[PDB]
Amino acid sequence: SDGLFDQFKTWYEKRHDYARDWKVRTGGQVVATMCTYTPEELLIAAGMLPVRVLGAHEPQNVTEPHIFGMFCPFCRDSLAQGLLGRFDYAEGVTLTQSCIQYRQTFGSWRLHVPTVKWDYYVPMPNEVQSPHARKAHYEEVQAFRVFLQTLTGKEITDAMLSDALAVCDENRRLLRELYEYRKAADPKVTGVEALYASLTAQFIDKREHNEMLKKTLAALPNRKVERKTGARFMTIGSENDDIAFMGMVESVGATIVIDDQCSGSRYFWNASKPEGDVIKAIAERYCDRPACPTKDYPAHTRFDHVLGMAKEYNVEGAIFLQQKFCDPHEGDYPDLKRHLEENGIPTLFLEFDITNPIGPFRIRIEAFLETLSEE
Amino acid sequence: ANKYPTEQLKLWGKAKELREQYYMNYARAKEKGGIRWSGSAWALDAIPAGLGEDVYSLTGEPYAAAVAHDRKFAKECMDAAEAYGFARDLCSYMRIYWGGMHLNKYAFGGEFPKPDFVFQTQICCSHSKWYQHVAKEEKIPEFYLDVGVGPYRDMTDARLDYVANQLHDGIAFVEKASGRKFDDELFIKAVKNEMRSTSRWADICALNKVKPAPLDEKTMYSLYVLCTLSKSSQWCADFMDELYEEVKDRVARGIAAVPNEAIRLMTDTQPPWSFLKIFRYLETYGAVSIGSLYTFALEGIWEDKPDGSWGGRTLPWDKGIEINDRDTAVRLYADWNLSKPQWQHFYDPTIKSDMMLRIIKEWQVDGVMLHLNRGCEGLSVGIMENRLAIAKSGTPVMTFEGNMGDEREFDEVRTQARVDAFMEQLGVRRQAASAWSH
Ligand SMILES: CC(C)(COP(=O)(O)OP(=O)(O)OC[C@H]1O[C@@H](n2cnc3c(N)ncnc32)[C@H](O)[C@@H]1OP(=O)(O)O)[C@@H](O)C(=O)NCCC(=O)NCCSC(=O)c1ccccc1
Ligand code: SF4
Hints:
The complex is a heterodimer of chains A (375) and B (438).
Chain A: H1 6-13, H2 15-26, E1 30-34, H3 40-45, E2 49-52, H4 73-83, E3 92-96, H5 100-112, E4 118-122, H6 133-152, H7 158-180, H8 191-200, H9 206-219, E5 231-236, H10 243-250, E6 254-260, H11 265-268, H12 278-288, H13 301-312, E7 317-323, H14 327-342, E8 347-352, H15 358-373
Parallel strand pairs in A: 1-2, 1-3, 3-4, 5-6, 5-7, 7-8
Helix pairs in contact in A: 1-8, 4-5, 6-12, 7-9, 8-10
Chain B: H1 12-27, E1 35-39, H2 46-49, E2 55-59, H3 60-69, H4 71-84, H5 92-103, E3 117-122, H6 126-138, E4 142-146, H7 157-178, H8 184-206, H9 217-220, H10 225-230, H11 234-252, E5 263-267, H12 276-283, E6 287-292, H13 293-297, E7 302-304, E8 310-312, H14 326-338, H15 349-362, E9 367-373, H16 377-380, H17 383-393, E10 397-402, H18 412-437
Parallel strand pairs in B: 1-2, 1-3, 3-4, 5-6, 5-9, 9-10
Antiparallel strand pairs in B: 7-8
Helix pairs in contact in B: 3-4, 3-5, 4-5, 5-6, 7-14, 8-11, 8-14, 15-17
The complex binds benzoyl coenzyme A and iron/sulfur cluster (SF4).
Benzoyl coenzyme A binds at residues 8-9, 12, 19, 40-42, 61-62, 65-66, 69, 219, 221-222, 225, 228, 270, 276, 280, 298, 378-379 of chain B.
Organism (chain B): Aromatoleum sp. (strain CIB)
Protein name (chain B): BzdO
Binding site for [4Fe-4S] cluster (chain B): 124, 376
């Protein structure tokens, strides 16, 4: 309608065009990134454009020789994008350790995408709850910095790292400000619009993306809302990047007012702490971030984070979107469901392949909406 | 069929009895005020051993495999876990273990015994989730060692620091949870015994390189399992030495596990129980499985020997390295475990591919049968890149799908037909090669 979020929608639809033109404009390298734990500040400080690999949500038959079909649709969809040449402009590829299934995407990509010139695996600690994890991750981040300085031949100074962290933290703060509008009774930002913003943050130059977020927030105070809010939903899952599916959800008489997913809140939630040692500031920002299920032990801190978000954004119903075969989220799901339901939030469970016909999902969401309207 | 002498393993009965005693000791732990704990076969079990000689583990994956042998009980356990609400495509050992806990039934009789604490290693994602649910249902303390520091070959001081410092937290944890004072002498003894048993298991496996193979992998499943029960115990280390003497005597005497041996096979991950009968059928072709990276290195610890071959890792006291104090023992113990071959593919599948190609060479393997194991994400990640690397090398290789713990996902009929087709393929290849070289 008013088209306020059209720049984010263009960036998402035309992400590869954007990357190629960025290389023309800057002379810089592009790095395909995997998992939201990638320490992007280092890549930015090294003069590089980080672009998060995402799937295309279309039929594909190139990954069967590389990844066995017992593994999730996302790790296979992502790998196909590399094999099909759609990230051929990316010189680098990098993964920061998390879910073990995702590590296959990285391993097959670096071995079989012939445009890869360098790769790096960051073994970020999984046990962020350990008193030793932040020292261990400090040294991983410093070692990646040394790798990147050696690779480019250019010293990556503390000043360059601080300026990059400042851009990333500004992006995180602006995304949090954008999210704040979703708490209102009639949100000036829909779930789809929020997702266009939060997803493109992961493959657009953060300086350019911040400028667009600032323009967007400058408009929001005076933005007219025409649509009815309907039921207040939360979406929960691992990546959850099928924006078309989210648009179906919001067309049934609902608004997604908050999420727990790596296309959204779990990517950006916290900015780093003020801190004079920039490597510590960066490494700890990631250790302190709301945890992937894989990194959430011995305590399930995720359960309090998800319920807290649900309460803070006045959620009426929570929708679990699950990738087939997704072990980390499958391991949390039964008790996280219970935690929400015991605290007054009914839930719906939906399970996804690489592609699925949307009609059966719409019928289920419409039925869920009915449950909300009773009691 | 008359090519080689054969003989049944004489220590068979003792291997069986040691395993039975392990499970019975866990169930009877409290009769004399012992300690019980649970965790993976990959848990660093010398740390709980510092709390006394009456500290009994139940390792989760071998226990679940023992339930899986009882198809009916395993189905009941998985049905209970599904009723709770867990997805059926989660790790089949984890689902079996959960269901047996909810049913409150031990596979060896009696209630499911309550552990005093969880002590776990985390490298597979399901390693945390498995015992998070257990510790919550049992209301017990829980500790997790994060060993995700990347390939052993890339190890740094800081990476080893992270694991060693966590182990010191683990010592404090087990003291708190048990109420006992940790004893450096018992701990160091347990570290040394774990180094002995895991290196000696590797030495035993390395005897299988000769023709005829003295062991078959079906027989080895009753032998490699001891280190998955309590690799840090004296009984396990002493049995591995005894076992090595017997296998050395088999090699000296030209004893074959399979008397008509003509074809040597290598497998990969843990198979379903129903496959064992296929090994027996394979023997009518003269095919013997000599092993797998799984049997050799789920617990076996290896090094490069002076001739470039793969053998048991040298014990530090045979290298002039003393172990006389807790801090030295902790760091050496972390380093020993980080070298485990079966942890490397969690980071880089090509490390496992190279390991499989080296086993094919050194154990003189004619053909490879890969289990695409839908029941275990942790040991299946990278499996198709491993198949590709073996395919390129020119060694015959086939796959079959299964699930080690849930036979709903294993097709006995189709798998046996695929394995028979493979035997035909190996024959055809032999005829062609002979025709080319006359
Ligand atoms: C006890 C079982 C369970 C059964 O085994 P079986 O032996 O097959 O069955 P039986 O007990 O009934 O014995 C009868 C058989 O004995 C044979 N025989 C007779 N005389 C001799 C002789 N003198 N010598 C040799 N053999 C002799 C006789 O031929 C007969 O067999 P046949 O009918 O002819 O074919 C044993 O295989 C075992 O412990 N497996 C290990 C499973 C486990 O717990 N694994 C660890 C999971 S950890 C993991 O996965 C993981 C960990 C961490 C991370 C990730 C993953
Ligand atoms: S998936 Fe395999 S490696 Fe992971 S807990 Fe289960 S048995 Fe262990």
